[PDB]
Amino acid sequence: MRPSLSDYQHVASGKVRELYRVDDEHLLFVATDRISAFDFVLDTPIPDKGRILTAMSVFFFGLLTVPNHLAGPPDDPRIPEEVLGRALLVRRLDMLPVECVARGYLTGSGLLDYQRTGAVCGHVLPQGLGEASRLDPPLFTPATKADIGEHDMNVDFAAVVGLVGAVRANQLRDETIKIYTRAAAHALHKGIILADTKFEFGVDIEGNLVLADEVFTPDSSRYWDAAHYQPGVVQDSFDKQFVRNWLTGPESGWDRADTPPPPLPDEVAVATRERYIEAYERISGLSFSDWIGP
Numbered sequence: 123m124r125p126s127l128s129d130y131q132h133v134a135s136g137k138v139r140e141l142y143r144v145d146d147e148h149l150l151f152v153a154t155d156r157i158s159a160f161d162f163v164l165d166t167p168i169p170d171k172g173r174i175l176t177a178m179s180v181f182f183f184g185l186l187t188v189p190n191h192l193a194g195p196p197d198d199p200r201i202p203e204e205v206l207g208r209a210l211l212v213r214r215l216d217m218l219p220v221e222c223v224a225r226g227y228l229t230g231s232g233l234l235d236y237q238r239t240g241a242v243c244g245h246v247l248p249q250g251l252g253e254a255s256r257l258d259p260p261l262f263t264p265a266t267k268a269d270i271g272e273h274d275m276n277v278d279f280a281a282v283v284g285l286v287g288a289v290r291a292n293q294l295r296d297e298t299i300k301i302y303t304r305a306a307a308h309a310l311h312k313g314i315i316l317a318d319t320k321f322e323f324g325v326d327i328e329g330n331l332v333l334a335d336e337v338f339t340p341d342s343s344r345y346w347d348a349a350h351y352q353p354g355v356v357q358d359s360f361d362k363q364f365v366r367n368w369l370t371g372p373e374s375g376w377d378r379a380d381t382p383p384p385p386l387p388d389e390v391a392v393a394t395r396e397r398y399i400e401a402y403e404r405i406s407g408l409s410f411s412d413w414i415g416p
């Protein structure tokens with residue numbers, strides 16, 4: 123008999139994720155079916171999105187050789203039936219207060235910072251770059267969390283040193299770039315560009331650095347279709363472009379310029395679920411039909 127979710131203490135909520143205390147040394151990391159676009163959590167959930175993204179994360183943890191916070195199998199008996207397939211039992215860590223971001227391509231706030239200053243997070247870049255320019259080598263572009271409705275603020279390496287220590291900052295930088303490089307190469311081999319990615323790390327009792335969040339999901343990372351990669355224009359979101367196009371199209375009745383957006387057409391939600399499955403199966407070489415669920 124699996125426990126009820128109500129047996130555990132809710133300790134944190136994100137836009138589309140939840141965190142629960144299981145015991146003194148373990149948490150339950152829960153992905154929901156909610157989806158965010160234009161910094162709004164949309165009214166309409168995407169069926170199986172939580173399960174698909176959990177499957178993705180589990181695959182990438184297995185691909186990487188670095189210590190991670192997984193503390194049991196996807197069907198661990200401590201996982202409630204209600205969240206089976208979209209929840210992971212993890213080890214409690216002392217989390218480091220740094221959003222560890224790697225960018226292989228220049229877009230979003232990285233692009234904006236570059237267009238404003240010529241630099242991103244302390245990195246002075248060549249002149250002449252633009253939207254979706256390839257960065258080589260990938261950049262460590264750390265950020266810190268701000269207030270509830272605010273975007274993370276980009277910071278430089280010295281800021282990271284000030285947050286975690288000089289040696290630890292080096293370690294975060296090196297591991298972030300190494301992990302991103304490995305996963306990006308794997309994905310691209312399968313036809314998907316991982317343009318960038320965001321990690322959080324924590325520290326265990328012995329002082330070891332442990333990867334601890336979700337890793338390389340389309341929420342934590344920009345997924346692009348490599349077959350349509352065209353530098354100089356904004357790349358379609360592999361998973362969210364249908365959602366984006368409808369919301370800003372002639373059928374939504376919504377002006378993006380910060381009214382809460384309307385619910386999505388069922389057809390758009392279903393199409394979106396399909397894109398998540400496509401991305402998962404291509405990258406993992408596995409079938410989502412095999413992934414556990416209620």
Ligand SMILES: C[C@H](c1ccccc1)n1cc(-c2ncnc(N)c2C#N)cn1
Pocket residue numbers: 134135136139140141149151152191212213214215216217324334335336
């Ligand atoms: C910000 C992020 C979060 C995730 C899910 C929902 C809301 C927030 N978070 C992660 C921890 C955390 N703390 C201790 N040990 C861990 N292994 C983890 C993890 N993962 C605390 N917060």
